[PDB]
């Protein structure tokens, strides 16, 4: 059968899919000049980078 174990497949997929979205949003720059903390620290001063 192609998908008789779909329940276990749905379980192992929902965990990885939600976890990959968390890594995806790590590269998302929330209204900032850069998403990498090393890029903002290398471009702005502490009073402006905050």
């Amino acid at each position: 059968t192609p998908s008789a174990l779909g329940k276990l497949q749905d379980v192992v997929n929902h965990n990885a899919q939600a976890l990959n979205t968390l890594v995806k949003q790590l590269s998302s720059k929330f209204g900032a000049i850069s998403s990498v903390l090393n890029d903002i620290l290398s471009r702005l001063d502490p009073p402006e980078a905050e």
Partner: protein, 50 residues
């Protein structure tokens, strides 16, 4: 040091590439009037790239 600057409605736009951006050669012309940077810091322009 072009000795000739264009008007405000026909402003020039020089493109710079393939060279080391040594900004230390700027602070030997004369005491400036304004250096209000935006998006970056006037101090950390050395180690950055463009």
């Amino acid at each position: 040091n072009a000795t000739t600057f264009a008007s405000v409605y026909a402003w020039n736009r020089k493109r710079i590439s393939n060279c080391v951006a040594d900004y230390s050669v700027i602070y030997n012309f004369a005491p400036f009037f304004a250096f209000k940077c935006y998006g970056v810091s006037p101090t950390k322009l050395n180690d950055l790239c463009f």
